[PDB]
A paper describes a structure:
CTNNBL1 is a spliceosome-associated protein that binds nuclear localization signals (NLSs) in splice factors CDC5L and Prp31 as well as the antibody diversifying enzyme AID. CTNNBL1 is a widely expressed, highly conserved 62 kDa nuclear protein that associates with components of the RNA splicing machinery. CTNNBL1 comprises a HEAT-like domain (including a nuclear export signal), a central armadillo domain, and a coiled-coil C-terminal domain. Our results identify CTNNBL1 as a unique selective NLS-binding protein with striking differences from karyopherin-αs.
We crystallized full-length human 6xHis-CTNNBL1 and N-terminally truncated 6xHis-CTNNBL1Δ76 (to generate a fragment that is necessary and sufficient for NLS-peptide binding). We were unable to solve the structure using molecular replacement and therefore crystallized selenomethionine-substituted protein for experimental phase determination, solving the structures of CTNNBL1Δ76 and that of full-length CTNNBL1 from crystals with the symmetry of different spacegroups. The overall structure of CTNNBL1Δ76 reveals a superhelical coiled coil composed of α-helices stacked against each other to form an extended configuration, in agreement with circular dichroism data. The structure can be divided into three distinct regions: an N-terminal pre-armadillo (PRE-ARM) domain (residues 76–176); a central compact armadillo (ARM) domain with helices tightly packed against one another to form a solenoid (residues 177–416); and a C-terminal domain (CTD) that projects out from the smooth solenoid of the ARM domain (residues 417–562). Residues along the central spine of the solenoid and the CTD have low temperature factors, consistent with their role in stabilizing the core of the molecule, whilst N and C-terminal regions beyond the CTD display higher B-factors for solvent-exposed residues, implying greater flexibility. Preceding the ARM domain is a region (PRE-ARM domain) comprising 6 α-helices and connecting loops, which do not form the ordered triple helical arrays that constitute armadillo repeats. As in HEAT repeats, the CTNNBL1Δ76 PRE-ARM helices also contain conserved hydrophobic residues in the buried interaction surface of the helices where they mediate intra- and inter-repeat packing. In order to probe the NLS binding mode of CTNNBL1, we generated multiple mutants of CTNNBL1Δ76 based on the crystal structure. Strikingly, all mutants retained the ability to interact with the CDC5L NLS3 as judged by a pulldown assay. Thus, CTNNBL1 likely recognizes NLS ligands in a manner very different from karyopherin-α.
Numbering used by the authors: 76 to 563
The structure:
Amino acid sequence: MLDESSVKKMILTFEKRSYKNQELRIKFPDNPEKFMESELDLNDIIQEMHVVATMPDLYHLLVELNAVQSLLGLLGHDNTDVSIAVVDLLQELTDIDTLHESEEGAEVLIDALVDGQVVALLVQNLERLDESVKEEADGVHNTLAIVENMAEFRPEMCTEGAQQGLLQWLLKRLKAKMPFDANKLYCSEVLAILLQDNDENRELLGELDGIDVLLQQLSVFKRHNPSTAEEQEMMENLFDSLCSCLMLSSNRERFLKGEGLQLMNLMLREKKISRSSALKVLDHAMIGPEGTDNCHKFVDILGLRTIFPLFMKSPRKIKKVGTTEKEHEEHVCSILASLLRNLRGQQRTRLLNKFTENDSEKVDRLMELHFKYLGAMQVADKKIEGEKHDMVRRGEIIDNDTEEEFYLRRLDAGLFVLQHICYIMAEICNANVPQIRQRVHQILNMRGSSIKIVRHIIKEYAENIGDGRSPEFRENEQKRILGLLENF
């Protein structure tokens, strides 16, 4: 080990050499010979400095002695070897394992770096590196390691970082006509983090024509499978990114114009590995009111003929793919629920037609699913009553923390899909089609379930609905939904 004073010296040496080199570079610009040694030193000491990351306790030392500010000046150094060695150091310094060791050290340095506008300085650095040169491609990888490290410790900076030119770089890097590459995979991972719960970055993606990018890149896997598990993990990151963007009502319009629906559709038809995610996207593209135009387009392009088969039978591939029956059933019903919510006109009619062909077979299915999930809910709830009874025996007050455990168990049992199924039933029964009401009541009353149980599930659904959006919205939906009970 080394000591505070043995560290202060090492830094003061850096500053020494940093300064020296800057001067000689400015004073002897034509002649590598006069400054080169100065450089090799800066390089060596910059490297030696890595050891500082071992003791994150002494991080005020790097800010105090002005080491952090010059170190950024270095990212712009006219030779890549210095610039990349800086990045190396920034990666080691900023490694999350390290940043958790001492709060103070972490806290002070991040502030220095934000102050520095590091993300814009790293991006200027990226714009000059050439991935054809191996040591520079590793530089891209390492700068990307940093933003990840920094976002893991402090998410709020991602907004600033993205705007600071990063998002644009990523988009151009994913587009670029270059063979698939570990840096490409990493770009994909880093992009999706930038968007995680971040409307500001999701919109900025929109404005940059991000969606087109995601759709060309995703369209590589429409008919053919991806070669490798790395290249398959990228695809999945692209989808992740894509769904995240669709969380914002403004991107639904951009998706549509990008012929996004057609792609996800084509994916479903070709039944490749993309199919599970493509179904998820469709779901995100249609979910609430901001789904409306997309719903209508879905039908226009024949989405109905693609989705209902998947409503009737859940895919064989389930043991191999990773998406479970439950998940798959969750999305389809989600999608139908959005279709029933938002469709009007010809398209609505065509949808309702699917419930009448042939002897209302889809109604039977719907009700098959009703019982499946209802049943699971009843066990889940019974178990919960039991546990509450056992808490009282044992003297344990139930609290919100308990309630949250309980909620999660219901979520795992199929609460959401159950809610959707019942919404669908109710909407179906309010299309003034006697055939369809009959089948529901027929089916419902003879067996062990009842209108009463369904009505109840709807109310709960209404009550907790629109958790997402605005106080006036939550009022309006709740109203509309509860209106479906009048003729049911």
